[PDB]
Structure formats: C-alpha cells, structure tokens
C-alpha cells in the first residue's frame, strides 16, 4: 500500500542510499521510520515571485506580537506600581514589600520571555521557509505543521519511504556523478576519500543502466511454498518455516494499512502502520539487522531470507559447496594386517 525501502540498501553498512542521496544514515533512519519530515521538492519561481508579500505579512505578524507584549508589560507595570503604592500607604515591611516587587518583576520577566519565545519561533519559521531546499529535514513537528499551514503550496514535504522514492525520482545522477568527479580531481583530504566512497556507488548506478529506484519496493516477491514447507505433525499440530510467519506479518500489516487508508484514519495511525509495514518487510528480508529481531515462541529469532545464505548452515556452505550423497555408507574401522596396501 505504501513503498518500502530494502533494508539491505539502508542498514547495510555503508548505507547505499545514504551515499546515493548524500544523506546521513541517522537522518535516513528518521525519514524512513517516520520520525522526521523531509522536503521532497521546492517551488523556486513561486517562492521568489511572492517573497516580498510574504515578508511583509511576516513583519506585520512580528509587529503584532511585539505590540501585544508591550501592552501586557505596561498593564502589569502600572498594576505593580499601584499595588506598591497601596502597600506604602499602610505599614509595609520593607522585605515583604520587596517580595511583592519581586513577584511583579517575575511576572514581567515571564511575559517578556513568553513573547520572546513566540518571536523566536516566528523567526525560525521564516528563516526556514526562506532557506528551504530538497533533502532538508524538519525534525520539529510544530515547525513542519506551521511551514505547511503557511507557505503550504510552495513546496512538498513527506515522511517514510515514499519521500525517499520521490527524492530518487527528482534525483539527477549524472549531475552528482560529475560533481563528485570534479571534487576528487581538483581537491584532496578527507573530503576526497568520502567523495571516492560515494562515487563508487554513484558510478555503479550510472554506468550500468540500473535504476536506483530498485532500492525501494512497491511489491514484495513470495518464494514458492515448497521452499517454505508446512508439514502436519502428530495430531492437530503443524510446523512451518519462519518465512511463513514473516510473510503472514507482512500480509496482515499491509491489509490493516489498506483498512486505515479506506477508513480515512488519522495521519498518526496510518504513519504508525506504514512504519510497522516497513519494519516487518525488513524482518522478512534480514531480521535483526535493525533493532531487535522478531521472535517466535520461546523468544527465538525467526530465520529470515538472508539467514538462508549466511553461515555454515546456509545454502552456500551446507548445500552447494558440500552435499549428502547416495551409494555411500559408514562403519567402525578395525585394523586388518593381512590386507595389502
């Protein structure tokens, strides 16, 4: 129902997506698992042809906040002066009088600091919108909700693997490849080594005609049933490979996501379900690679598709480089000295 990243190309060190898009792996972790929004596209001409009007409206909003702050502060200051005059009219202990004065000054400081926090949030919003660009992360939910409430139609932002798919769509690989070649050729240092590392994968995707979009999936293949056997045990019991339970979890989560989509569910619940779908596909492919592994009965991790190949028990060591054979036997040896060599 929603695209999913192949955990091999996200969590497999080094993050192949983290090199392709030049994103940090922790930022990729935030984007794919619905912790942070990312800016997929920014409308340059529309932001430039309306910057004057938006800045004007912004300045008026800030002036309004400042005028309200000054009104509140003046009201409180007159109130405090009147109260201290009332106390000075009667017998007023100097220390309790200064307690009242300090309470008033604290209230004023709180008014001013509240107004200043609001003005700082406004400044942050404006400076962020003026410096919007693709591949940028908005980690604050409030900041993104503001940046879409205002200026909403000037850009696009998204979470999850759908946004990574979009970033790969709007990605010009030849441009970044030639940029990295120029950086490597006309420079040196640690940035040179990082650029060589990135150029490895970028040129691998470029020279071959393999689309990088393959790193995100919209459908998952299902291995034939004979390779994930289900056998009837003694009685009503049954036995299955772990692959079947992983496929069952992926299926159930995709179905629940479809239900939530059709039901017009809150964005929070649907994002939870998309995150769970991504995590279950990651378990099906390489369990335990990110976070804790998925466990069956008895806290035992489930053998993933990748486990089938790895280790001495994997297909390579256990079924291809060596096999059990026919026309063969075994027995205890005894010494026969009467034998010939």
């Amino acid at each position: 129902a929603a695209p999913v990243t192949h955990i091999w190309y996200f969590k497999g060190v080094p993050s192949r997506l983290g090199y392709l898009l030049d994103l940090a792996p922790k930022d990729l972790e935030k984007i794919i698992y619905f912790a942070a929004y990312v800016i997929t596209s920014v409308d340059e001409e529309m932001r430039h042809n309306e910057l004057s009007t938006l800045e004007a409206e912004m300045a008026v909003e800030r002036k309004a906040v400042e005028d309200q702050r000054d009104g509140e502060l003046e009201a409180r200051a007159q109130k405090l002066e009147a109260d201290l005059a009332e106390l000075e009219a009667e017998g007023a202990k100097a220390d309790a009088r200064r307690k009242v004065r300090d309470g008033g000054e604290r209230e004023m400081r709180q008014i001013r600091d509240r107004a200043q926090r609001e003005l700082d949030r406004l400044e942050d919003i404006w400076s962020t919108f003026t410096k919007l660009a693709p591949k940028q992360l908005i980690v604050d939910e409030n900041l993104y909700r503001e940046l879409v409430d205002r200026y909403g139609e000037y850009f696009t932002g998204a979470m999850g693997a759908e946004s990574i798919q979009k970033l790969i769509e709007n990605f010009d690989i030849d441009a970044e490849a030639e940029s990295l070649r120029d950086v490597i050729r006309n420079g040196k240092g640690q940035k040179k080594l990082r650029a060589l590392k990135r150029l490895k994968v970028v040129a691998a995707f470029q020279q071959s005609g393999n689309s990088p979009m393959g790193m995100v999936l919209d459908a998952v293949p299902v291995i034939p049933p004979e390779l994930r056997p289900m056998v009837q045990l003694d009685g009503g019991r049954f036995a299955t490979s772990d692959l079947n339970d992983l496929y069952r979890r992926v299926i159930n989560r995709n179905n629940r996501l479809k239900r939530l989509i059709d039901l017009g569910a809150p964005e929070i619940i649907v994002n939870n379900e998309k995150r769970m779908l991504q995590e279950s596909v990651d378990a099906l492919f390489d369990n335990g690679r990110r976070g804790r592994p998925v466990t069956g009965p008895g806290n035992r991790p489930l053998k993933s598709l990748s486990d089938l190949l790895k280790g001495k028990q994997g297909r390579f060591r256990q079924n291809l480089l060596g096999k059990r054979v026919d026309y063969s036997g075994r027995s205890v040896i005894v010494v026969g000295p009467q034998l010939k060599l």
Partner: protein, 164 residues
C-alpha cells in the same frame, strides 16, 4: 464528522502511548502488541461516534483492547502452530525413491499375458482405455471405431484377461 477525527487526536492520542505498555503486558511480544494496539485503534475510530464525550476515554479504549485480545487469543490459538526442527534439510520429502519409481512404473509378469494371449484388437483398446483413461469417444477416435467396437473390445478384453 471532521470534528470527531480532531476530537480523537486531541485527547486520545496521549493515551495511545500508555496503551502500548498495556498491550505489551498481555502479549509479551513487541511485534504482537503493536498489531494489537493498531487493531484496537481501527475498532475504536470506526465507531468513535458511539463514545459519549466528556466521560472517560481511557477506560473505554482499554476495554476495547482487552476484549479484542481475548478474541484474538481464542481465534488464532485454535490451531497449534510451532516451528520446524533447527535444520530444514531434515524435513523429509514424501516422494518415491528412484528405485521406488522404477519398479512402480513398469509392469509385472502378466505383461506377456495381455501382449500375446489377447488379440491386438483387445490389447490396444484395453491398454489405452485404462492406463490413459481417455473418454469413450477419444478411444473411438484413435482406432477409427465407434462406441460399438470400443466398448465391446473393452468388455471382452477384461473377460479375456480374467483368465490367467
């Protein structure tokens, strides 16, 4: 009503985090508690208009999760599902062996009874009506003979082979 969906995210989403710790106390499996908590949210959002505002939503949602777990327990624990042995290569195929499929595809010593003792009219019609299981009109087509010939050579070839 769009006022009900905003009524949901307002005062019931902070409960969603405290319910995860509750569903975990019941399923003892994080992958299962998440499926249970989401299934509770689907069941509560579809019938949110059935909740009366102002009253306790936390006690309402918690009883939804408790009931959908008792149902989900008896629904899926009706069939005991456990794991294969640690090596999957010891799960036996249930096919016949090369020796077993050789002696089972051939025929016994009677293969010379139906070959020589019966006429080729009975031999060819009986061998293709029982082994192949062709329709009565398909065996009519192979030998250019009607039902009167095919159905007869079969009835008589069986009584022929009843001997020996």
């Amino acid at each position: 009503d769009e006022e009900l969906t905003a009524r949901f995210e307002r005062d019931a989403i902070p409960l969603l985090d405290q319910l995860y710790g509750g569903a975990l106390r019941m399923t003892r499996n994080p992958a299962d508690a998440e499926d249970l908590l989401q299934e509770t949210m689907v069941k509560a959002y579809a019938g949110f208009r059935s909740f009366r505002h102002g009253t306790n939503l936390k006690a309402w949602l918690y009883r939804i999760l408790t009931n959908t777990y008792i149902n989900s327990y008896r629904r899926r624990a009706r069939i005991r599902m456990e794991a294969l042995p640690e090596d999957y290569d010891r799960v036996p195929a249930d096919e016949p062996n090369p020796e077993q499929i050789y002696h089972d595809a051939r025929l016994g010593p009677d293969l010379q009874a139906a070959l020589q003792a019966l006429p080729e009219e009975f031999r060819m019609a009986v061998y293709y009506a029982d082994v192949e299981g062709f329709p009565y009109k398909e065996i009519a087509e192979i030998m250019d003979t009607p039902i009167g010939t095919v159905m007869s050579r079969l009835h008589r070839g069986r009584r022929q082979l009843r001997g020996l």
